Symmetry: C4
């Protein structure tokens, strides 16, 4: 079990660190920044790379909504669920913790305002998208993400390619909804950075818990049911 | 059969949502938009990801030109073609629907004006290209795309890699022809967003439903015949 | 050996069409251009996609220096050499032709002047490098290209991945040279477009035959001797 | 064992020449420059391609920290450690040497003033990050990298996908840190270009030997201990 939890912690820690890291440290860098499309890749890679390395230990979740989604899909044990979620959330915090430290080594940093790569909606959305839009897009993408995970993990799917699917799947998702909610689909990755924003990010933090979980559950049931 | 239909439906939905969705949400974002290459990647990824996820169910077409292209080349049962094509068009439209709703959360959005990521040519070509150009490009790419599909699915090609190839083929295609026609090579995709543009998008819609399927068949036959 | 040459022809076409195509049409589009890196991806993506498609038919060369190289390496029969190359150069020119036609569709185009994605050195070096620099870099990336081809195809290399390895390999090479010579490392491609330039493109072309093919040999022997 | 050393040597050469190449030759370049994101992909690719190519000959380290890290993970014999490092460092220097020659071809170039893609911190950090911040990323991303390298190569991990995991993992590392330290995480890479800076680059060179090797060893101990 430990292995499983450690796998899930470093996994997520890696997700956040690389994800919000590129987000914070390189995304809008003066002239050579990696923009949204860079951050999009980054995130996916944290999952593509971590899935290979430790996926074979836990399940390569690194996401609460993926742990809960795989559950509603009949793939994951309801017993081990909670642990997995804590582990993911803990790893994420430890990540944003260092990230924050690292980000401070530069003049002008500020977790608040900058948002510390926190997710939000309306007035707190990158594009200024309505909460509703943030709801619709998060849902579809969360559902679709589990829909792809269950598919790439289905015993009839090209074995060993799963990580690539799931990985790049997250890159896709980002390329899509950054302007809306700065992309979440992961209540662990959203909590981690909110903690260090400690403002609106924490107020809307709930949103990025219910919404992703619900959608992942739909994605799971959609696969368990219609396949 | 239903699975095969649901698979193709969700698959296309993913395609229109991810591809068109990124183009209508992030491609032109201020200082961090993903640009064309951004969109190109995303598009190919919807395919690469669903190609793995549900590829092992419906064969992973998601494109009416791909299905008919396979039939032509002699790999898909003519007795199933129309079933897939419906599922796909329906899927794509559901996507365009949600995308439409989502894009409206940001003040100042206008489907018709903006183009809702529809395909066109001349006066409607992103780079303002002739129709002759739109015709040649879409044709060649469509063919090549189908040939790549046939060759990648040949019993002698590396097993399981297909999805990586076919998806990256579509990214390659979008990197080459977004300035021209905004890259279609998919009737169901073109239809979905066009409907929400109402105007000229539907006015040239036929173009991206004849040219694309023609090329797909030429490509299919190219391989079935010569290899 | 028809099937082989057919493949070797369509492939090269897809290469010159997708690479130079992306260069001339997208690359520097008003404000969403795929840029140098976009091209770089595209170029590689052509080889990655065709290797999977017809690689299982002709060995997926699509490059004179990759055939001469495989020969020097001792993987390709000297017999089938001249045949491949012919096909490779042919298919390329047919692509550059169609591209030319497509490129002329936009008001303002001009094959000469713009350069039509041809390769050159100094006065014709994208960044205006010396011929010496042009030489050294074309030499290192040719040899390296082959060493990676030979290796990724050694009976002891991860089977089925070669296409990815060689494809992304080309991308890497384009990410590096571009500013120097627009990245050749393929006598076939350099020719195709040089023809339609009809100016210096042809004048310096000789350079883009001897240098890549010499390098391709260096690499062949390199891996064939020391591994 | 000469093959293994030749393998590690060309590998690393391909690494420095490829990454530092794209870096000092393309990242900047006018309106098309590949910037950090391009440079990031590049480096990753050099590893990915060479990993498939000669990875089956030496284990594909191309990084002193990655060789010493593996050693700590109980995956590499200490006897061969010192040999590998010499190979890698020599291969790197040779790359910087030519790359130096190539960049010098363009009018107006000063390896010194330009930095020549050297790693540094504080006054020499691209984004002006403090040494503490430098220390932290470098450390984390090194232990992380080495960790991913272990899991991807675990007997229970997906066979053959390692080179994709690792190489892509390095691209990630670069997406997150370039602003900070310009991303070393490889003592052989740092050394190579420093030599041709010959000012501050060498001045801080030590830091990029101890930090990434400490990180790399911790990484492995983590996998050795917690798997
Ligand atoms: C099962 C869970 O496994 P983990 O997810 O926890 O991950 C491992 C760490 O265990 C290993 O020590 C390192 C090097 O990193 P170092 O761990 O931070 O420790 C050495 C060290 O001493 C602290 O007191 C400083 O504290 P703060 O985070 O409180 O500062 C906040 C502003 C810290 O910055 C410094 O790096 O790399 C991590 O990824
Ligand atoms: C032109 C239109 C039709 C196309 O040729 O193909 C036929 C498919 O179905 C539809 O017209 C309907 C969408 C309701 C299929 O062959
Ligand atoms: C060190 C851990 C910090 C958690 C603090 O979180 C935020 C800060 O990042 C912000 O700049 C301000 C002022 O409001 C605080 O609550
Ligand atoms: C910086 C602290 C570095 C601790 C490094 C671990 O070092 C130990 C060696 O000392 C031991 O003999 C070998 C045996 O295979 O196992 C290693 O992991
Ligand atoms: C293990 C990484 C150790 C990093 C140690 C910091 O090392 C630096 C020195 O190199 C520098 O010259 C002095 C000046 O007062 O400041 C120290 O903090």
């Amino acid at each position: 079990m430990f292995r499983k939890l450690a796998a899930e912690c470093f996994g997520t820690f890696w997700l956040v660190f690389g994800g919000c890291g590129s987000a914070v440290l390189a995304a809008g860098f003066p002239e050579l920044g990696i923009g949204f499309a860079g951050v999009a890749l980054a995130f996916g890679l944290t999952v593509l790379t971590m899935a290979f390395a430790v996926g074979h230990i836990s399940g390569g979740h690194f996401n609460p909504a993926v742990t809960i989604g795989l559950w509603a899909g009949g793939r994951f044990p309801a017993k081990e669920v909670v642990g997995y979620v804590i582990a993911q959330v803990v790893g994420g915090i430890v990540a944003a913790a260092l990230l924050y430290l690292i980000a401070s080594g530069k003049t002008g940093f500020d977790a608040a305002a900058s948002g510390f790569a926190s997710n939000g909606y309306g007035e707190h959305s990158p594009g200024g998208y309505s909460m509703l839009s943030a709801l619709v897009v998060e849902l579809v993408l969360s559902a679709g993400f589990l829909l792809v995970i269950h598919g790439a993990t289905d015993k009839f799917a090209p074995a060993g390619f799963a990580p690539i699917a799931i990985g790049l799947a997250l890159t896709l998702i980002h390329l899509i909804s950054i302007p809306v909610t700065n992309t979440s689909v992961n209540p662990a990755r959203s909590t981690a950075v909110a903690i260090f924003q400690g403002g609106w990010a924490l107020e809307q933090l709930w949103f990025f818990w219910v919404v992703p979980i619900v959608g992942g559950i739909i994605g799971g049931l959609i696969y368990r049911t219609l396949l």
